[PDB]
Design a protein around this ligand. Structure first.
Ligand code: COA
Ligand code: COA
Ligand code: COA
Ligand code: 26P
Ligand code: 26P
Ligand code: 26P
Lengths: 274, 274, 274
């Protein structure tokens, strides 16, 4: 949408000098419009086109600017109080709306406005930050986090305490992406724009960033930045040249098979009852 | 209780076709009765008999069915709202009740109805899921999670960010069990029905599942599925056959001694003041 | 303050026999006074003097005694209820106060009374326990925890799911300290009085306690208890004598450089807008 993109790209250049007081109504209204569209899933920060994920840098820009244009407001918790500038997505939902949108939200799961949550998902107590997109069938297990602008595929299981990297701080070029049908094991973390290709199974306590060596013991091939579709990855180490010590790495031990599927399947009984 | 077990086992077979609308009052009432009993500690999903933990599969079945028989309801948070089908355990407690039950609940710790919490425990902000049982004296530290149906012994310390596996998704045969007097170090995870025997000390960042090799450096013995009573376990790796790389494992480095006890003791000053 | 320190040190000796009922008004009032001072930053549990961090053991004592002198009270959550004896820091703040104190508090972040939060910090949903001190510019990312009495420097970034050890349980001699300008990578844990010196970068999934070997591959020097200023630390292992297995350790791989700074910088656009 040019009328919106234009204003966004002009404002971004003046980011440092914009404040909630000096911002003109045009930039304010535009940024706000863009956040509502992300919130509804009409727009998304990254999308797959021709077998490639592309990032719309200007939607990322809008997310950033929202922090320069909005002022903080006291939010009343019950026993306590908060002071922040991004509204809560569900603050205004009624049963009819929850009923139509079709996902389950377990207290105290919290989602910021500007994040899209699809039908048939289950959010256990967890956090979904602004700009993120969580597709159909996915479960975000306890204390997991979906970082700003992150893209999560359909039928994905993000285990307890798992973290998917954001793009706000530290600042990142690209969002982190988890394709369809992946299983991410407990306490693992995927950051810095790494792409976990569809049907992959990441074991527990695996840490993937751009500097992480993803070693394929079968081919000897070492990857960086992505997990090839259908891999089973676990933690390991690679020895130094003198064998004096070893350093952490992720190892692709095999391709997903029946034995693997037996341990990571989604439970449909917990999904939306049509 | 046969009158209840019977109905449960009949219904479970039709699990996929049961919905909150078509379920008959008999199955509804039964499942509900069983959840109240788990909630009060009168029944428990697994129990130790003759030096063996046994799982009552039908109590697990009842837990599962509760998700087929109950409908979602809007739950009013303060700044936000939730939409789920399992009530909050403490929603109706008054001071007299908390005073009688004798445990401490630190905001925003949350527990689902159907989980048993014993006297003299302390829940820092954490999550205890349906069907779980948390025995006397235990502390569940910050952002720890006690998964569905998990069994936690007396005087156990579950450190910050620790996860004890559930049985709902992925679906599991048996609950995860932590016997009396264990210490589980920060950020560790214990899943898939592994049993951590009494008096064991699990260090930080240790990940135990059924596939994890638990290597005893002293005997060369490799365990699977359980941590022998009184072990001190830490993270390590075992080399591949070509020494080309190494893969994660848990190592039993020694048996708990005075030096160990010095670092993992429970603080009675924080327990219930009789 | 002698008038306060005296009462504190006398009472501490009788800790086990003090209860909320038998405690005399003098000890009660004193302990309470000391907690208010910690809350405001007028006093702090540890402080750096002459290039050395010193711990005021008696302020730690006061923190402990607060648990012997105060009784539990029901705290009304919205959907649920809690029962604890430490008030919520922000329960009484209004917009004017939040506006003057100058930090951002993202729901559902929670802080206990007795912890100091400085200007220009951002608390994503996280936990800050009693006695802690969080200095200017710092961000406490999602599900991170600042343990009791811990000291966090200025401009520090505590990543998602990071844990900084407390001193209450297990009981510790000294608080854990993170000096200015450090970056602590996701899911890492720093405990047992370890000191991370200024400008250091701790990677993801690094676990540091007093028993952790911090190996400097360049010098062959092995540290214990502290991370030398300006280090980049990552997870690794050191081989056993027979090469039969290896055990976890932290490795200092290099000194912070431009390439490192490129990945761990603070985003000023998210800080307080003056
Ligand atoms: C990866 C996983 C799914 C097992 O898959 P699997 O297909 O059964 O893997 P296998 O048991 O066949 O092992 C295949 C190889 O990988 C290794 N391996 C598998 N999982 C491993 C793990 N977690 N740690 C170390 N090694 C592991 C085996 O040692 C084996 O190596 P080898 O061929 O050299 O001997 C399992 O380890 C896992 O990650 N489970 C997830 C638990 C979880 O997070 N639950 C959520 C709770 S909220
Ligand atoms: C295990 C632990 C308790 C130390 O116990 P300990 O009995 O003092 O162990 P020691 O220091 O004697 O070490 C014994 C052996 O295990 C090793 N070791 C112990 N803890 C280790 C750890 N965390 N990482 C790596 N190695 C460890 C030592 O290297 C030593 O190996 P060696 O005999 O080959 O040289 C400690 O490491 C730990 O896990 N503390 C828990 C911290 C925590 O989670 N706190 C909660 C904050 S919420
Ligand atoms: C440490 C880090 C910042 C990279 O710093 P860097 O200066 O770019 O490090 P480099 O890529 O130059 O690597 C230097 C050495 O350390 C290694 N290394 C760096 N980070 C590593 C990691 N996470 N795991 C394993 N090895 C790592 C490299 O293998 C290399 O070893 P070599 O010299 O023997 O080949 C990055 O790994 C990291 O920790 N990012 C933090 C992500 C995070 O938690 N984000 C927050 C999300 S909430
Ligand atoms: N590492 C997180 C930081 C989020 C910070 C944030 O959302 C805020 O300041 O409100 C992210 O990049 O998503
Ligand atoms: N891994 C968790 C998943 C819990 C899901 C749940 O409780 C729900 O759908 O409400 C568990 O098996 O306990
Ligand atoms: N490991 C934590 C334990 C905190 C316990 C606590 O604060 C309480 O009992 O209220 C700490 O030592 O800070």
């Amino acid at each position: 949408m040019q009328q919106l993109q234009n204003v966004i790209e002009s404002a971004f250049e003046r980011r440092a000098d914009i404040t909630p007081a000096n911002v003109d109504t045009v930039t304010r209204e535009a940024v706000n419009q863009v956040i509502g569209l992300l919130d509804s899933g009409a727009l998304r920060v990254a999308e797959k086109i021709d077998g490639q994920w592309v990032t719309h840098q200007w939607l990322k820009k809008a997310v950033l600017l929202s922090f320069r244009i909005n002022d903080n407001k006291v939010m009343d918790g019950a026993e306590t109080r908060y002071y922040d500038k991004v509204p809560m997505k569900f603050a205004d939902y009624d049963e009819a709306r929850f009923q139509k949108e079709g996902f389950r939200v377990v207290p105290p799961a919290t989602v910021r406005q500007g994040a899209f949550i699809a039908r048939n998902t289950v959010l256990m107590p967890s956090y979904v930050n602004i700009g993120a997109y969580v597709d159909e069938g996915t479960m975000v297990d306890t204390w997991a986090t979906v970082g700003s602008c992150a893209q999560i595929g359909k039928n994905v299981h993000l285990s307890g305490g798992v973290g998917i990297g954001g793009v706000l701080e530290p600042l990142q070029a690209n969002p982190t992406i988890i394709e369809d049908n992946c299983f991410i094991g407990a306490r693992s973390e995927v950051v810095e724009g790494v792409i976990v290709e569809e049907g992959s199974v990441i074991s527990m306590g695996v840490y993937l960033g751009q500097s992480t060596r993803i070693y394929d013991r079968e081919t000897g091939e070492i990857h960086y930045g992505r997990v090839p579709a259908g891999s089973v990855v676990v933690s390991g180490n690679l020895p130094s040249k003198d064998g004096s010590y070893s350093l952490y790495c992720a190892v692709i031990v095999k391709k997903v098979d029946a034995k693997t599927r037996g341990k990571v399947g989604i439970n449909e009984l917990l999904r939306t009852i049509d």
